[PDB]
């Protein structure tokens, strides 16, 4: 019936995409010496596995989240705790620092993204909003601005939320597996989302449209980050490979792998020049890759459990890592 | 020295934050965390009601031991992407209805779920408290519907004591790591009084055994 006619059209279109991409394959990216960072600061205080960490825009503050039921706002230069925020739900999977420094996002198995107000007359930190509406766990959240946040969840969708009204304004559908991570374009116009379909999608924030679908992993994508100029992504997955994708070519550009890495990738990030790609693994360490050659550039060792999160400051000065051993470390 | 008047004050604030985190940690350390798993249309609701949408948390106090149970039903998403978040729970409570045997039968699904959790890499040292639910319904059904419906090899009497023991054995032998964890099995129904005492006693045994390993007697 019409069901088979449409499935046949879909297969024909998949091949048109394949060939359009093959037609652009006239080169590969493959056609920094050694990186030796040291721990400069160790941030102690969490009493449970850390799942999320995010740098603020002043390159000095951090927000981190763990299963001890708290968020901690840290002074990365002095190691002082600035704030500690009790959570209503201890099963926190993600957090985010607003670019303005005014708010913190947080959530996980409660399927709610909570927004915390860090700058109040009372001196304390309060929940301003609970962005309920996802049916699956919140896997990742990122702010576009003080009134807008982007979320992804275990129900296979992503959403753009209006914080003041607490509503979804745009729902981004089309992934078939749980969505694991978000990354925002430098100009906020595009999102990239990774999922358990072993694929990533490029979304137009203003429309709800999926512009491109990137495939190639043998397993779930756990993390995605944008290359600093906005025209490429790096992804990391359970197949223990990181992959670089080209948004203008709609192609995989390079892969990062090694025979001795059979562990999953939990986090990816780029340095300012985009030359170094950093990835956290289930080996309790982080590998630093030469993003343009795929050589290993160096290793950040020192965690006693899985590295769960990475981040690089906006000024490019430091790398923070966090793990399941309950500590954060700042590398430079 | 070397700090300004305001940095000294910022440090004092940080130290008070650490004090409060430690005190809160000590309190958490004395709570019993229980994960609640089970078959659909089973006894999970029965157990919570007798003992007492995303993750649902229920609190209990019994014989001065404080418990928190985490119901992870509703979260119809990929288990492999979050179940590790319960590594560290004291015990897992797993619900199976005895009546599942003649309803792929529900009992087969219940055994498959049990095995996926029981032999999960994240729960290697976590014990299971197994509730075999609706025993009164089971007696009424077993006398007409034998266990050979889902367990063809069964050759015992079609009555509660032998058939129920058979079912218990079928679940307890799904434990592929008998050296690290025990399965505590209790037969219950919609009306009972002992489910809280049972969980309490099973938990107390789990605590003692974990302390033998922690203390080096292993």
């Amino acid at each position, epitope marked *: 019936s019409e069901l088979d006619q449409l499935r046949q059209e879909a297969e024909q279109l998949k091949n048109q995409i394949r060939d359009a991409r093959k037609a652009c394959a006239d080169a590969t990216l493959s056609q920094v010496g050694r990186i030796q960072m040291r721990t400069r600061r160790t941030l102690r205080g969490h009493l449970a596995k850390i799942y999320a960490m995010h740098w603020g825009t002043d390159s*000095r*503050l951090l927000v981190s989240a763990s299963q001890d039921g708290k968020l901690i706002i840290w*002074d990365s230069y*002095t190691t*002082n705790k*600035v*704030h500690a925020i009790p959570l209503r739900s201890s099963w926190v999977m993600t957090c985010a620092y607003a670019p303005s*420094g005014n708010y913190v996002a947080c959530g996980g198995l409660d399927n709610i993204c909570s927004i915390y107000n860090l700058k109040t*007359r*009372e*001196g*304390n930190v309060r929940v301003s909003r609970e962005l309920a509406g996802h049916t699956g766990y919140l896997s990742c959240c990122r702010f576009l601005d003080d009134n807008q946040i982007v979320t992804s969840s275990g129900d296979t969708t992503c959403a753009l939320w209006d914080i003041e009204t607490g509503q979804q304004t745009t729902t981004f559908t089309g992934h078939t597996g749980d969505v694991m991570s978000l990354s925002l374009a430098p100009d906020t116009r595009l999102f990239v989302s990774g999922a358990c379909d072993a694929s990533a999608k490029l979304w137009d924030v203003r429309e709800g449209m999926c512009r491109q679908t990137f495939t190639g992993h043998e397993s779930d994508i756990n993390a995605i980050c944008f290359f600093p100029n906005g025209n490429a992504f790096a992804t990391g997955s359970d197949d223990a490979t990181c992959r670089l994708f080209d948004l203008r070519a709609d192609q995989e550009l390079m892969t990062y792998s090694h025979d001795n890495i059979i562990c999953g990738i939990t986090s990816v990030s780029f340095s300012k020049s985009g030359r170094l790609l950093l990835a956290g693994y289930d080996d309790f360490n982080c590998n630093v890759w030469d993003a343009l050659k795929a050589d290993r550039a160096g290793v950040l060792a020192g965690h006693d459990n899985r590295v769960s999160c990475l981040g690089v400051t906006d000024d490019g000065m430091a790398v923070a890592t966090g793990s399941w051993d309950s500590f954060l470390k700042i590398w430079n | 020295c*070397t700090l*300004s*008047a*305001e*940095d*000294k*004050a*910022a440090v*004092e*604030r940080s130290k*008070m934050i650490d004090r409060n985190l430690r005190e809160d940690g000590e309190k958490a350390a004395r709570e019993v965390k229980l994960l609640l798993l089970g078959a659909g249309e089973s006894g999970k609701n029965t157990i919570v009601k007798q003992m007492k949408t995303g993750i649902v948390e229920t609190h209990f106090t019994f014989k001065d031991l404080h418990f928190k149970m985490f119901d992870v039903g509703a979260q119809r998403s990929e288990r492999k992407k979050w179940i590790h978040c319960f590594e560290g729970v004291t015990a897992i409570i797993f619900c199976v209805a005895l009546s599942d045997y003649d309803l792929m039968n529900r009992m087969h699904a219940s055994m498959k779920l049990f095995d996926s959790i029981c032999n999960n890499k994240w729960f290697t040292d976590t014990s299971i408290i197994l509730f075999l639910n609706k025993k009164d319904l089971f007696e009424e059904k077993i006398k007409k519907s034998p266990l050979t419906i889902c367990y063809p090899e069964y050759a015992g009497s079609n009555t509660y004591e032998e058939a129920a023991a058979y079912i218990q054995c079928q679940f307890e032998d799904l434990n592929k790591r008998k050296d690290t964890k025990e399965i505590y099995t209790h037969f219950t129904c919609s009306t009972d009084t002992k489910n809280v005492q049972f969980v309490f006693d099973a938990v107390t045994d789990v605590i003692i055994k974990n302390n033998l390993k922690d203390c080096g007697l292993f």
Partner: single-chain antibody
Amino acid sequence: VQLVESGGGLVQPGGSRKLSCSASGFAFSSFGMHWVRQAPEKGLEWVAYISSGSGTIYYADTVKGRFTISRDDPKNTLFLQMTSLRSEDTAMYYCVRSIYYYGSSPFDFWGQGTTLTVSSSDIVMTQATSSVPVTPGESVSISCRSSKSLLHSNGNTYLYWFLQRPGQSPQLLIYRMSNLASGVPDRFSGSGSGTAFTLTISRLEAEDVGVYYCMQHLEYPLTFGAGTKLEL
């Protein structure tokens, strides 16, 4: 956010009084507190400080040994117990809110004050001009000098500016040498060298006429300049 002082009125020299300062509308236990005194015809003087958690206590050496500062967090109450009172202690006593963390703005809330009448190596700062005639819409520059650099090794300059309107307690305008207080309009701004500072009002409004004070917060005791009055 409210602070209400009490315990004022006339006491004879050698006697004693307690000022109470009841707080509401804020997380009192998270803030340190200060007492700031103002003699009837004078500027501001810092008297005492108690940290949040009561870990740290400082006193001016003009009151140390006679005054005791204490707090009772469960009752949101800040006390100052003064004994052996002198005619020197006649003043308005203000209860002042202060929280310290990276990015905080200390001294952002003052109470209204209680008036106490008693019968009969510091860093210091100079406000060279005691008075500036002004009109609405005019550009006004208020200067202040320090005997010591207020610029620390941590990169911050510890200079605060406050405005006391007639009949009102002081308002914080600026908390880092150049960092404007919340609720204060863009009309106000400031800068400095670490020893020389300026407060700028780009256009003066009639409502902003009053006495501007320069405060040092690098070291204890905290100190203030004499104050510059605008006349409109």
